[PDB]
Amino acid sequence: EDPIHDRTSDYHKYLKVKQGDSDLFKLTVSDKRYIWYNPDPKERDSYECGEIVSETSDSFTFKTVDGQDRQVKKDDANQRNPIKFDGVEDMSELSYLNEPAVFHNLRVRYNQDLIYTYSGLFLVAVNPFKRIPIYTQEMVDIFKGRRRNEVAPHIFAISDVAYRSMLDDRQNQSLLITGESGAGKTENTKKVIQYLASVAGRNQANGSGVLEQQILQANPILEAFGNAKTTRNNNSSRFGKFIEIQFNSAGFISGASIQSYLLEKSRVVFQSETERNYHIFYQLLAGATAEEKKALHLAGPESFNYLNQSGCVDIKGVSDSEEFKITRQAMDIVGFSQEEQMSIFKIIAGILHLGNIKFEKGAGEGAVLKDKTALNAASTVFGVNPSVLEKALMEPRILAGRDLVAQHLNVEKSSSSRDALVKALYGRLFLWLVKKINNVLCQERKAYFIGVLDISGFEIFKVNSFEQLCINYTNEKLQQFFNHHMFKLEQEEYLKEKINWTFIDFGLDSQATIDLIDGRQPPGILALLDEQSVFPNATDNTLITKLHSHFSKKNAKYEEPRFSKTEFGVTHYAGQVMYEIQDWLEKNKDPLQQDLELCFKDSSDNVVTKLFNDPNIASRAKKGANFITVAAQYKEQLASLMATLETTNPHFVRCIIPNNKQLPAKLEDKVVLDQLRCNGVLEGIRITRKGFPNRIIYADFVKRYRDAEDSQKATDADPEQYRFGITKIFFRAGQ
Ligand SMILES: Oc1ccc(/C=C/c2cc(O)cc(O)c2)cc1
Ligand SMILES: [Mg+2]
C-alpha cells in the first residue's frame, strides 16, 4: 500500500538505493579495511581504493591498484567507510568524514540517479543533466507532511519542512539555493514553487487553482526575457530573483511577489562567441505568424546584428517556435491583454531594428545615417518620430553650464548611445513585466511567507566584466551567509549558553573578499569605482590605476597582474577571477541621452510611453548632485535582501554541477570536489556531528510532548548526548 514501504513503487525505483545482491552482501560483511589514496601525488582529487594490509601505532600500509605497497601516517589517512554506508541518505552518519569519502557517497547515489543527498542539516543536489521522473504529482503527494527522516532526500522534502516550520513556529522561512552557473538552482527553485503551490494550494475548484496557476506561469515569462545561452548553461538566468510565496494565517497560499535583480542588459547588444541573446528574441522570429512578421518587419535572426554575431542562433533540443507558444500561454494565464502582448513584441522587434542602424562618418568627424531603413522600421513599431529619433541619436542636446549645446557624435559615440537606448528599453520592459506580474499575484496582505532565492550563479568567462563582478560578489555574500549561520551564529549560541564548548575555527570566511569589494572605510573596489564615476576626468585607465594603488600588494585577495595593465584579480571563495576594466565607468554611470528619453515619451504606444513616463520605472534616484550609480543601487538592494533573509529561518540547498560539459552520467571528481570544498560542505557536516543542533529554554521545556522551570531532573534516561546552558538545554544529534 504505502509507496515508501512498497519496493515496487516509482518512489522506491527512483528515490531509494537499489537492493544489493548476495555478492555485494559478501563484500559488505568482509573484515578487510580500505583507504582512499592518490595514485598520483599531483592529482590530489583523483582517488583509488587500497586495502590496508598492516599497521603500526601511527601508520597504515596498503596495497595500491597496481600492486605496490604504500605507507601513510594515520593522521593523514583518508579511510574508506564500511561499504554498508555507500549510498547513505544523510552523510552525517558516515563513520569517516573526509573528502574522498564524501565524494564517493555522492558518486554511488549519482550512479543510480539519486541526485539528492543530505549533508547534515542541508541538502545537496548534483545536476543530472537528464530527465528523472521524480517530480510528478504522485511524488508530491508522498512527501506531504512527512518528517525529513521518514522519507528519502528530495527538494520536496526540504520544501515541506520549511512549510511545517512556518506553521509550527509562526516564523517566516527562506530557501537559499546556492551553486555556480549551471549547477541546478533554477530547476530546483521551480520545484520548490511547484511543491508549495500544490501542498498549500486551494483544494477546491478551477478558480481555487487560478492564483497557484498564475504563480507557476510567471516563470516561463521571466525566463523567456531573462534567460539566455552562455558557454556554461543553455538556460542561464541573467537576472537574480527572490520569490516570496505568501500564506494566510490558515497556512494557505494567499499570493506571491517577485523581486528581480541585476539584469544583464549588455547581453541585448553583445554576446560572446557561441552564446545567444535572450531566448525571447529567437522565440519571436521563429514562432511569429506571417502576419505579425509583416507588421513587425521581422526576418531571420541572421538578418540582425544583435543576433548574428555569436555564430549561434539555436539551442540543441530546444524549439524556439514551440517555446514562443509556451511564453504566450503564460502571458494569457497571468493576465497580459492581447494589446499589451503586441506592444511587448513591438518593443522586442523595435530593439532588433535599432541594432541594424549603421552609423557612418560624414564630411567631418560627426556621424550620419545614409540608409534609414532600420531607423524607420524601428520608429514605426515603437511609434515615434524617426526624424526626432535620428537627431536624438547623433545630435543629442546637453547643457554646458546653463547653455543648450547640440552635440554631433561620431560613429563610435552614436553607436554607443543607440546601444544605451536599447539596453534602457529592454531593462525597463523587464521591470515592467515583473511589475505587472506582481500586481496580479499580490491580492492580499500575507500572514507569512517562504522566500526562495535564485540568483545568477558564480561564473568565470575568458572576459569578465562589471556584470561578473556583481554576480560573483553576490555569490560570495550568499556563501558568507551560509558560513554565518552554520558556524558563527551556531557557536556564539554555545558561548552564550556556556555549555562547555571550545570554539572551533572552521577556516571558512569570505569577509576579506567581501570587504575588498564593498567596503567603505577604507574604500573597496565599488567605492573607488563610484568615486571615479563622478570625477569629470576619469578614464578606464585612471580607474584601474586607482584600484592598483589602493590594493596592489596591500590586500591579500587582490592581485595586480604582471601580464596585463587593464585587469585585476579578486580571490573569491570559488576561485580567483580576473576582471577586465574596459567600460566600467560607463556601465556604472549607465548614461542615456535625455533627448532619447524625450523622443520616446511621445511614443504612441501605451507600453512604450509607460516605460519612459512611469517614475518607478523611468526615474532614477538623483541622490546627491549625481544620479545613483549601478554599484550603489545594487549594493543597496543586496543589503536590503540580506536584512530580509535575516528575519527568516534559512534552509540551504547546495547545487553541485558534475562537470563543465553539461553532460549526464559524467561525474568529474576534480570539478565536484572543488565545489564541495569552497561550499564548506564537509565543515557543515562536522559542525553538525560535533555540535548540539537542537535546544530549548528550560522554563519552556516542560514536555511539549510538573511546572517549576528547571528542566529539573526531567532526566528521561545520556550525560554525553546533551548539555545545560545558562537558559536552555542542548542535544547532541538525535532526539
Ligand atoms: O547534452 C548537451 C547539451 C548542450 C551542451 C552544450 C554545448 C555547448 C555549446 C556551445 O556553443 C558552447 C558551450 O560552452 C557548450 C552539451 C551537452
Ligand atoms: Mg539559473
Curated annotation (Swiss-Prot):
Myosin N-terminal SH3-like domain mapped to chain residues: 30-82
Residues covered by the Myosin motor domain: 86-735
Subcellular location: Cytoplasm, Cell cortex
Chain spans, region Actin-binding: 638-660, 723-735
Modified residues (N6,N6-dimethyllysine): 130
Binding-site positions, ATP: 179-186
Posttranslational mods: Phosphorylation inhibits thick filament formation and reduces the actin-activated ATPase activity.
Record text about domains: Limited proteolysis of myosin heavy chain produces 1 light meromyosin (LMM) and 1 heavy meromyosin (HMM). HMM can be further cleaved into 2 globular subfragments (S1) and 1 rod-shaped subfragment (S2). The rodlike tail sequence is highly repetitive, showing cycles of a 28-residue repeat pattern composed of 4 heptapeptides, characteristic for alpha-helical coiled coils.
Note: Dictyostelium myosin-2 has no K(2)EDTA ATPase activity, perhaps correlated with the absence of a Cys at the SH-1 position (688).
Family, per entry: Belongs to the TRAFAC class myosin-kinesin ATPase superfamily. Myosin family.
Quaternary data: Myosin-2 heavy chain is two-headed. It self-assembles into filaments. Hexamer of 2 heavy chain subunits (MHC), 2 alkali light chain subunits (MLC) and 2 regulatory light chain subunits (MLC-2). Associates with elmoA.
Function: Myosin is a protein that binds to actin and has ATPase activity that is activated by actin.
Protein name: Myosin-2 heavy chain
From-to range in the entire protein, with total length: 3 to 750 of 2116
